[PDB]
Structure 1
Amino acid sequence: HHHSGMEEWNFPVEYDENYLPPADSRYWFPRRETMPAAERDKAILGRLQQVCQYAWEHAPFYRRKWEEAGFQPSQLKSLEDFEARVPVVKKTDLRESQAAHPPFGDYVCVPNSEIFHVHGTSRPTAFGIGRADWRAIANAHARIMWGMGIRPGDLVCVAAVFSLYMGSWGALAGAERLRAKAFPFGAGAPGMSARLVQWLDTMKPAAFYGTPSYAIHLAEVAREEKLNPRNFGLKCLFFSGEPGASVPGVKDRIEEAYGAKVYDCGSMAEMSPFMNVAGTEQSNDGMLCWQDIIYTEVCDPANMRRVPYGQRGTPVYTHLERTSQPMIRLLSGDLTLWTNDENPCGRTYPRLPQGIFGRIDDMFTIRGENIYPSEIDAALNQMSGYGGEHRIVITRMDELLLRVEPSESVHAAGAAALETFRTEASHRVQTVLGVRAKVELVAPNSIARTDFKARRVIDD
């Protein structure tokens, strides 16, 4: 047994399948979840050394990538060495590896005979998950679902498509390991939602899994079917796959529609167990980073080194308990804010208070400061007077200009209504960015509208 007191802490992991926490325990693993972060970081470092050494020996993808970047496992002697020496893995590197070594790439590690399930992404990426990794996922997900207040015997509805995507399978595996009554109804086919609302009104689930948008659609289908969604008897709904569970307006509407608590969870399919970022019953706002399952680093995309707590960056993830297709510093490309304050549940994990929002796409620097176009887009979309289009113009790091469309009604209301909107837009942009921007208005329907992804940045 490990000197850290950490429960079933070993690599490769082999969890006791019959263990269930005492019924009065808040934590599935009290020590792993509440030990001082400094001691957990020491244990994490030792695990990263084991995992990197493991990939060096079983994955030519990593040995090659690391050798090109001048890294070798003997060099990993601190978490500072991990961020500075180990290069990040991109999705394009995974697709390249799978194209050169089909079907699963040369980072699979396990022999082909160990592959239990085949899943994938929406050129697609193939997931070849080993038996041992499937057990490691089910155990981590049961542990995190316990944290949400979900218990043995509870009826758990998994209402997400059961296909290629890791989402629904991960929730179902967690529900099975927890000894919950699993109700794998799924989603995606016409006529399903109207059938589900009758099943939920009869069966009375204690918990529901899906996407926030599907839960909003199911609430509407219920009212069309002359059913009250508050009568399904749900204690909670837990969501992954898209934003919404940490967006105040969206979360509040779902909590009101169902009369239950909403929990945010979910990193990436590549990062299963994806509930490694998840809220708890008491830390119900945003998500906790369950660091001893998967090591999350919120980084500055300019150098891929950890940003200080209270700052914004990109989640970078490392598997600590996977032997098949392990991910070592996979860049998410998402945006988030992390803190390390006391958590209401008592868990000593970093928190993502606003969950995951935006992207690193088309990021630029205005004198040391990283500016994210998604953040400027989010700030303007808080305004009822915003017309739906804007452009980002940079001159001389140095000068930041924003060309913004007001809506048709603001433009019709006159000169004073346009100026009030332009001044408020300047105030809101400064708040979100934390840097001064010049704001100029442009006539409604002046800027090009694209059905594709908008590329709103001009020059540098």
Structure 2
Amino acid sequence: LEPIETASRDELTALQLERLKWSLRHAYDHSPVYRRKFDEAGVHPDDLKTLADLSRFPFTTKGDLRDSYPFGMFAVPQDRISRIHASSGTTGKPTVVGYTAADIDTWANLVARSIRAAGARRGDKVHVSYGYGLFTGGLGAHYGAERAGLTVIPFGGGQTEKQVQLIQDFRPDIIMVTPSYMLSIADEIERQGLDPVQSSLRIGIFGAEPWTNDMRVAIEQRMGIDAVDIYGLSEVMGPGVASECVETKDGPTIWEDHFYPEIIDPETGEVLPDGELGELVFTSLTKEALPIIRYRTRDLTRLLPGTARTMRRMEKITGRSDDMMIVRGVNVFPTQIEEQLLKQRALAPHYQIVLTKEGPLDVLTLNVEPCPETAPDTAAIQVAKQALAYDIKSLIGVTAVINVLPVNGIERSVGKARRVVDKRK
């Protein structure tokens, strides 16, 4: 481990304060957007005397980045930008980010830290299935595994049959991949009559989208691995903003020596005490090219005390604020549905939620599949469909039309699964 990972909280705090002061000054001096934002908010970098003072400073939102496209957020000259990446476009036009060579180095060290936290060992191979390209996931995973001194197998997305061929042949110890795509790889392993538990894989590091504890336990049992959660977003850096320690599996530990977290009430912008659910906000402490100050992530979670590290954790992401569905008056996230689906051993872990209107009433249709083994077993499927409907009603408050499709009926994820098709318009 790095010394900082077990430093005292006093030591960490002091380090954060020094770096936050630097970052605020760097943004104000070198990022025209932040000179304007700070002036129009009536604050100066000098106003930060303690970490609690961060709440004086304005927020940065997606809109700020969209307005400055492509390169208006940068705080260094274009000749110092070593790398361009973009967000994935999930909510709209991708936003563009940049990195100096030092920022690439920092990112590589943080992803390496996250891979260590997952339980990596000298001699491990890493099979990277996160997409390579303008997306931050693939190249971020790549550089971090390479920095960790491991054997990098840079496969990227797609070609499921080939990925399974190479998992057999190359015997990777670690896979870095979305949890939804992991399911497709697991299916393919089983489709070929192989036993996925006996795969060489020891560790899965899954991120890029929400996945429940229930999902983790299912995947762990099916693949014979430890699975840990890695979090990031492109505005802040990419994967490796936070990652779970495999010895606790209690939500990603935030690398807050580099990215300082807050939680706010999304409606008011007020800061909440640790433990309360709301919107996750980050400020970069060491970023050169694109310092980012109080970025409202639109990801919903809560901050929790350090366990396996000095650094605090986040709870597993509940969802994006954009993920929230309002169904006949009840607010529901896809993860809530997923938790109930994963109780049914007779059903696959694949799903899609389709929202419609029938007259004036909302209708939520949950499309599921049997496991391939259970498909012919009508009695098992029938119990599953009824128990799932009863769990969603009793625990979530929504009446879900459960619709069991043939095996392979649901379009498989290519990366970030689309959990929801809202046809209500």
Task: Give TM-score scaled by structure 1 length.
Answer: 0.72
Which 10-residue stretch deviates more, 293-302 or 171-180?
293-302
The structure 2 residue matched to 1:288, chosen from 253, 259, 284, is 253
Partner of 1:59: 31
For the pair 1:157 / 2:127, whether they are aligned, the reply is yes
Q: Give the whole-Å Cα distance in 1 for the aligned partners of 2:318 and 2:2.
A: 29
The structure 2 residue matched to 1:114, chosen from 80, 84, 88, is 80
Which 10-residue stretch deviates more, 208-217 or 73-82?
73-82
Q: Cα distance, 1:37 vs. partner? A: 2.1
Structure exhibiting the larger radius of gyration computed from Cα positions: 1
For the pair 1:238 / 2:208, whether they are aligned, the reply is no
Equivalent position SS for 2:143: helix
Q: Cα distance, 1:94 vs. partner? A: 0.5
Partner of 1:169: 139
Q: Cα distance, 1:390 vs. partner? A: 10
Partner of 1:226: 193
Q: Deviations over 1:259-313 (max 9, x none)?
A: 0000101131212253122101212232111210211112222333431222111
Partner of 1:348: 310
For the pair 1:71 / 2:43, whether they are aligned, the reply is yes
Q: Cα distance, 1:328 vs. partner? A: 1.2
Cα–Cα, structure 1 residues 428 and 220, in superposed 2: closer, same or farther, change >3 Å?
A: closer
Q: Give the whole-Å Cα distance in 1 for the aligned partners of 2:320 and 2:297.
A: 9
Aligned partner letter, 1:201: Q
Could you tell me whether the CA contact under 8 Å between 2:355 and 2:422 is conserved in 1? no
Partner of 1:358: 319
Could you tell me whether the CA contact under 8 Å between 2:83 and 2:98 is conserved in 1? yes
The structure 2 residue matched to 1:213, chosen from 180, 187, 194, is 180
Cα–Cα, structure 1 residues 77 and 454, in superposed 2: closer, same or farther, change >3 Å?
A: farther
For the pair 1:252 / 2:217, whether they are aligned, the reply is yes
Cα–Cα, structure 1 residues 262 and 82, in superposed 2: closer, same or farther, change >3 Å?
A: same
Calculate percent identity across the aligned residue pairs.
Answer: 31
For the pair 1:82 / 2:48, whether they are aligned, the reply is no
Within-5 A mapping of 1:367-386: 373-374=331-332, 378=336, 382=340
Greater RCO, 1 or 2 (C-alpha within 8 Å, sep 6+): 2
Cα–Cα, structure 1 residues 441 and 302, in superposed 2: closer, same or farther, change >3 Å?
A: closer
Cα–Cα, structure 1 residues 68 and 159, in superposed 2: closer, same or farther, change >3 Å?
A: same
Partner of 2:347: none
For the pair 1:29 / 2:6, whether they are aligned, the reply is no
Could you tell me whether the CA contact under 8 Å between 1:119 and 1:165 is conserved in 2? yes
Aligned partner letter, 1:356: I
Q: Deviations over 1:158-201 (max 9, x none)?
A: 0122111000111111011111010001113xxx1111111111
Q: Give the whole-Å Cα distance in 1 for the aligned partners of 2:166 and 2:362.
A: 51
Partner of 1:411: none
Partner of 1:319: 284
Aligned partner letter, 2:129: A
Q: Give the whole-Å Cα distance in 2 for the aligned partners of 1:404 and 1:114.
A: 52
Partner of 1:94: 65
Aligned partner letter, 2:28: W
What's the Cα RMSD here?
3.3
Gap runs ≥5 in structure 1: 1-27, 364-370, 392-401, 408-416, 430-438, 445-449, 456-460
Could you tell me whether the CA contact under 8 Å between 2:174 and 2:204 is conserved in 1? yes
Q: Cα distance, 1:80 vs. partner? A: 2.1
Q: Cα distance, 1:71 vs. partner? A: 1.1
Gap runs ≥5 in structure 2: 344-352, 367-385, 403-419
For the pair 1:180 / 2:150, whether they are aligned, the reply is yes
Could you tell me whether the CA contact under 8 Å between 1:49 and 1:73 is conserved in 2? yes
Q: How many residues align?
A: 367
Cα–Cα, structure 1 residues 377 and 111, in superposed 2: closer, same or farther, change >3 Å?
A: closer
Task: Give TM-score scaled by structure 2 length.
Answer: 0.77
Aligned partner letter, 1:120: A
Within-5 A mapping of 1:403-422: none
Q: Give the whole-Å Cα distance in 2 for the aligned partners of 1:249 and 1:87.
A: 37
Equivalent position SS for 1:264: strand
The structure 2 residue matched to 1:44, chosen from 16, 22, 33, is 16
Could you tell me whether the CA contact under 8 Å between 2:262 and 2:280 is conserved in 1? yes
Equivalent position SS for 1:317: strand
Could you tell me whether the CA contact under 8 Å between 1:379 and 1:428 is conserved in 2? no
For the pair 1:199 / 2:166, whether they are aligned, the reply is yes
Cα–Cα, structure 1 residues 359 and 70, in superposed 2: closer, same or farther, change >3 Å?
A: same
Aligned partner letter, 1:226: G
Q: Give the whole-Å Cα distance in 1 for the aligned partners of 2:64 and 2:95.
A: 11
Aligned partner letter, 1:143: R
Could you tell me whether the CA contact under 8 Å between 2:319 and 2:335 is conserved in 1? no
Could you tell me whether the CA contact under 8 Å between 1:171 and 1:209 is conserved in 2? yes
Could you tell me whether the CA contact under 8 Å between 2:280 and 2:297 is conserved in 1? yes
Cα–Cα, structure 1 residues 405 and 350, in superposed 2: closer, same or farther, change >3 Å?
A: same
Aligned partner letter, 1:137: W
